[PDB]
Design a protein around this ligand. Structure first.
Ligand SMILES: c1cc(-c2cnn3cc(-c4ccc(OCCN5CCCCC5)cc4)cnc23)ccn1
Length: 305
């Protein structure tokens, strides 16, 4: 009964269903022309995050198999009644979190998700001069988690949601983050302590800590374990549940120095053993001790052998 369309850049669009709840907007599955897309709608009060994500996607070189594909962004409506839209590709399998909740992964499936994920993060982190669109800066994501990794039909991963992302220009100090912070559960101990004056490398190391946790999520659901695979739980859920306070997290991560358990039986398999070692180095309390994104990709290659 739907002959009426919305229009985006003169093209017809129909909203289907709200599929996800962002930190900062709701995400709709929609049809634009003859393809499905995602329309992320932010209220006007979250203009800063919309603007940030738009700016990040506007940087040179921000098209890559392992970065969620940008389509466009626009302010909508009347200056009285405003919404902000950001349109990306749509991925029907959803986030790595959604998938791991419904499925176990084989070793080969895990390796593919991890390799593609680590490739996207490493690209995001890389400063690359000489692109046709300009000079790509290093970009920290600042909210790495399984819910921000989307899977394609073949389980290829891409990094999504750049509302908190921060670029670095090699002749300037790290710009203003406007008081906004990532998901508590995935926060590095230095972030939880309330440390300040973070600069580029500190921000990258914060991403790599969160990445360790995502890599644990995969490990935790992999059938290469020499024993049973438990039901999916978020990092730290076993210890502090689904809805932790900042103080809950400080206690578990900062004061007790605990991490999600890497079970010894997971490490019979040579590869899983290297995976667990890699995870441990990613989430080290010492930020300086943590692997780079490029190093993690090296390890995942080494792992596949
Ligand atoms: C963040 C995310 C996105 C985004 C792009 N695609 N996309 C897809 C989803 C999503 C899609 C499907 C979801 O359903 C749950 C899993 N289903 C269950 C039924 C069988 C298929 C898999 C849940 C979430 C969420 N967000 C996005 C766009 C912009 N910013």
């Amino acid at each position: 009964l739907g002959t009426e369309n919305l229009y985006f850049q003169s093209m017809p669009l129909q909203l289907l269903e709200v599929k996800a709840r962002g930190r900062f907007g709701c995400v709709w599955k929609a049809q634009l022309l003859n393809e499905y897309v995602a329309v992320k709608i932010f209220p006007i009060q979250d203009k800063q995050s919309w603007q940030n994500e738009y700016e990040v996607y506007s940087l040179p070189g921000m098209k890559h198999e392992n970065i969620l594909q940008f389509i466009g962004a626009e302010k909508r409506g009347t200056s009285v009644d405003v919404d902000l839209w950001l349109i990306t590709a749509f991925h029907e399998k959803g986030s790595l979190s959604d998938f791991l909740k419904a499925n176990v992964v084989s070793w080969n499936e895990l390796c593919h998700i991890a390799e593609t994920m680590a490739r996207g993060l490493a690209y995001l982190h890389e400063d690359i001069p000489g692109l046709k669109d300009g000079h790509k800066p290093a970009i920290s994501h600042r909210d790495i988690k399984s819910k921000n990794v989307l899977l394609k039909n073949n389980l290829t991963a891409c990094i999504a949601d750049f509302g908190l992302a921060l670029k670095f220009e090699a002749g300037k100090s790290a710009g203003d983050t406007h008081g906004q912070v990532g998901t508590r559960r995935y926060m590095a101990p230095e972030v939880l302590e309330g440390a300040i004056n973070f600069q580029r490398d500190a921000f990258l190391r914060i991403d790599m800590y969160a990445m360790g946790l995502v890599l644990w999520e995969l490990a935790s659901r992999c059938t290469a374990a020499d024993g049973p695979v438990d039901e999916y739980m978020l990092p730290f859920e076993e210890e502090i549940g689904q809805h932790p306070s900042l103080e809950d997290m400080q206690e578990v991560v900062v004061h007790k120095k605990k991490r999600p358990v890497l079970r010894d039986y997971w490490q019979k398999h040579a590869g899983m053993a290297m995976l667990c070692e890699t995870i441990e180095e990613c989430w080290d309390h010492d930020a300086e001790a943590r692997l780079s994104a490029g190093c993690v990709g090296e390890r995942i290659t080494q792992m596949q052998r």
